A = this chain, B = another copy of it.
Amino acid sequence: MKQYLELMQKVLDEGTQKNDRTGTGTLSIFGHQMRFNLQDGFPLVTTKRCHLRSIIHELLWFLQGDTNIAYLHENNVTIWDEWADENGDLGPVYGKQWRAWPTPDGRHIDQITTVLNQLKNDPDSRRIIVSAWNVGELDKMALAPCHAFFQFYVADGKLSCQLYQRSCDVFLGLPFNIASYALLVHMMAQQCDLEVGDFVWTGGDTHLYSNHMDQTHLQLSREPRPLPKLIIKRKPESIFDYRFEDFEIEGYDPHPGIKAPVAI
Contact = CB atoms under 8 A, between A and B. Distances in A.
Contacts of A35: 31
Contact of A126 (B31, B104, B135, B166): B166
A18 B178 CA distance: 27
A242 interface: no
How many copies of this chain? 2
B156 A16 contact: yes
A101 interface: yes
B28 A155 contact: yes
Nearest to A122: B21
A81 to B, nearest CB: 22
Contact of A31 (B16, B125, B137, B198): B198
A216 to B, nearest CB: 19
Contact of A151 (B28, B109, B138, B204): B204
Interface residues on A, range: 35 or more
A244 interface: no
A234 to B, nearest CB: 29
A131 B129 contact: no
Contacts of A102: 104, 136
Given A124-B19, A149-B149, A202 B202 contact: yes
A101 B136 contact: yes
Output the residue of A20, A127, A137, A155 with the most chain B CB within 10 A: A127
A21 B136 contact: no
A153 interface: yes
